[PDB]
């Protein structure tokens, strides 16, 4: 058991778009602390999104994450000597973070040339709601709505 309040880390806004929402997306796509390398990916990705349709690469990011962020999720829970996967709502602080999770993870496993156009490829592919990250969202939503029997916390 713990008594700690953990820690409240703050993220500074991105320098090219003035949106802290991209800052945690940058914070998510990180590998080995290479800040400069990864930010070259998103801006190149956002240029690809902007160059292919749309009007602003920042607003389709907003459109992308809601289609990825689930509204409910189960967790392993033991009450009566057995595991009951009680579906629980996802808090606003976690839904966007896990939205940033599933965009990079499934785009990393795509077959496109480089991540620069691979996260970009998923960005519009997820904004319209027909991508694998969108697919992963609904099966989690499929995991719930079937275990609805267990609703005690």
């Amino acid at each position: 058991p713990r008594r700690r309040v953990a820690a409240k880390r703050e993220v500074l806004a991105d320098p090219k778009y003035g949106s802290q929402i991209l800052a945690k997306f940058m914070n998510h796509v990180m590998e080995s602390g290479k800040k400069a390398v990864a930010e070259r990916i998103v801006y190149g990705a956002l240029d690809k999104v902007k160059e292919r349709g749309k009007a602003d690469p920042l607003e389709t990011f907003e459109k992308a994450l809601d289609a990825i962020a689930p509204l409910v999720e189960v967790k392993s829970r033991r009450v009566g000597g057995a595991t009951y996967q009680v579906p629980v709502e996802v808090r606003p602080s976690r839904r966007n973070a896990l939205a940033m999770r599933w965009l990079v993870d499934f785009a990393r496993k795509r077959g496109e040339k480089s991540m620069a156009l691979r996260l970009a490829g998923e960005l519009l592919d997820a904004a319209e709601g027909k991508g694998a990250a969108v697919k992963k969202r609904e099966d989690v939503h499929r995991m719930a709505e079937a275990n609805k029997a267990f609703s005690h916390y």
């Binding site: 320098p15 090219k16 800040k35 400069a36 930010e39």
Partner: protein, 126 residues
């Protein structure tokens, strides 16, 4: 005349001089665009003069030594922040609310005996 400030982030120290001028910068006799190839730190030097409206008010002379890429960026960033607090007195509250007067005390930890690095202890088998 000139206004001086000293800033340190990890191991670097910056000496900034806020003499009156138009808008120019000078870090180790080189400009902001040429010294620092990453545009993120280019805000880091200039966020302090954007929150307080002084973007075009001085030709700031800066020298730095030690640290690294971001380490110098924070050290120079802490550099000007004290200088406006030296240049005037009403910007202390505005800069403090943004967390700029505070010196970042975070540094690299001491490597540990029996430890590969900070807190990672070697893999063990039962």
């Amino acid at each position: 005349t000139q206004n001086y400030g000293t800033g340190r982030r990890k191991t670097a120290t910056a000496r900034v001089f806020l003499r009156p001028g138009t808008g120019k910068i000078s870090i180790n006799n080189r400009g902001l665009d040429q010294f620092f190839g990453r545009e993120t730190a280019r805000m880091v030097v200039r966020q302090p003069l954007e929150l307080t409206e002084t973007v075009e008010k001085f030709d700031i002379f800066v020298t730095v030594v030690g640290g690294g890429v971001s380490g110098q960026a924070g050290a120079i960033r802490h550099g000007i922040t004290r200088a406006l607090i030296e240049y005037d007195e009403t910007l202390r509250s505005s800069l403090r609310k943004a967390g700029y007067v505070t010196r970042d005390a975070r540094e690299v930890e001491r490597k540990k005996v029996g430890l590969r690095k900070a807190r990672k202890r070697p893999q063990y088998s039962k």
